[PDB]
């Protein structure tokens, strides 16, 4: 291609090219489109409809402040919108029915809309790390029962919906580290066998309302980890009471509390 380098499955590299918009006339059979590291500001998914075989779209580091969603990309499985400056998440369901991986990490989302994930029935991974979320809409994950990985790390969450994890029979990884959480709703984890949970870096308030969490931590000590930028060994003691001197939540007695 005159602007992007093509490799043949057909991978197209349009990255780090000072692009201000989608380059015209790309290979009709493009399968993977790299638009990473450019100067788009705004982008419309409808402009990609001509590429009926597109399964992976990377729009990371594109200075995006707005994302228009219309039309249909029927076989898109992965969408990377990380490292941009989107303030809101548009409704994607009607346009991306086959999506399994959605990454909107390191943006500036201040909230997620009601009914945000409707239609994303195949979603397996949702990354929202490094945004500006304070609370989440009820029923956020009702439309995505096949979710296996959920990352809400490094936001400013102050509360979690009691039923946030309802229906998630395949939940494998939950990242909630570095938020402003002080408690966990009774029954939050349900009977889910969650292998990897990251909960450190939060100002947990140890009082009678933390006992549900204390008991879950005791029962899941080997499933609590500390995040490390790399690729481990559990450390349940990483979850600490803020109203103390680094006292581990999993050892909080709760003396005198109603049982």
Give a description of the structure.
By secondary structure, the protein is mainly β. The protein has one domain: Ribonuclease Inhibitor (Leucine-rich repeat, LRR (right-handed beta-alpha superhelix)). 3% of the residues lie in helices and 15% in strands. The chain is built from one helix and 13 strands. The strands form two sheets. The chain has an eleven-stranded mixed β-sheet with strand order 1-2-3-5-7-8-9-10-11-12-13, with no helix packed on it. The chain has a two-stranded parallel ribbon with strand order 4-6. Helix 1 links the parallel strand 12 and strand 13.
Q: How many domains, as an integer? A: 1
Gap from first CA to last CA = 68 Å
β content, as a range? 5-15%
* The CATH architecture: Alpha-Beta Horseshoe
Spatial strand sequence of the major β-sheet: 1-2-3-5-7-8-9-10-11-12-13
CATH overall fold name: Leucine-rich repeat, LRR (right-handed beta-alpha superhelix)
Computed Rg? 21 Å
Share of helix, binned: under 10%
- From the helix content, strand content and strand pairing, which structural class follows? mainly beta
CATH superfamily: Ribonuclease Inhibitor
Count of alpha and pi helical runs: 1
Classified by CATH, the class is Alpha Beta
Beta-strand segment tally? 13
Taken from the alpha-carbon principal axes, the silhouette is: elongated
For the biggest sheet, the summary is: 11 strands, mixed
PDB class: blood clotting
Keywords: leucine-rich repeat, hemostasis, blood clotting
Assembly: monomeric
Entry title: Crystal Structure of the von Willebrand Factor Binding Domain of Glycoprotein Ib alpha
């Amino acid at each position: 291609h005159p602007i992007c380098e093509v490799s043949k499955h057909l991978e197209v590299n349009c990255d780090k090219r000072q692009l201000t918009a989608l380059p015209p006339d790309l290979p009709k059979d493009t399968t993977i489109l790299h638009l990473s590291e450019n100067l788009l500001y705004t982008f419309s998914l409808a402009t990609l409809m001509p590429y009926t075989r597109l399964t992976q779209l990377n729009l990371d580091r594109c200075e995006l402040t707005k994302l228009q969603v219309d039309g249909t990309l029927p076989v898109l499985g992965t969408l990377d919108l990380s490292h941009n400056q989107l303030q809101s998440l548009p409704l994607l369901g009607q346009t991306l029915p086959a999506l399994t991986v959605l990454d909107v990490s390191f943006n500036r989302l201040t909230s997620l809309p009601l009914g945000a994930l409707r239609g994303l029935g195949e979603l397996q991974e949702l990354y929202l790390k490094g945004n500006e979320l304070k609370t989440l809409p009820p029923g956020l994950l009702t439309p995505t029962p096949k979710l296996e990985k959920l990352s809400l790390a490094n936001n400013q969450l102050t509360e979690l919906p009691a039923g946030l994890l309802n229906g998630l029979e395949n939940l494998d990884t939950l990242l909630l580290q570095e938020n402003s959480l002080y408690t966990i709703p009774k029954g939050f984890f349900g009977s889910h066998l969650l292998p990897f949970a990251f909960l450190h870096g939060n100002p947990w308030l140890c009082n009678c309302e933390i006992l549900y969490f204390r008991r879950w931590l005791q029962d899941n000590a080997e499933n609590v980890y500390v995040w490390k930028q790399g690729v481990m060994t559990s450390n349940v003691a990483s979850v600490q009471c803020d109203n103390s001197d680094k006292f581990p939540v999993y050892k909080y007695p709760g003396k005198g509390c109603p049982t």
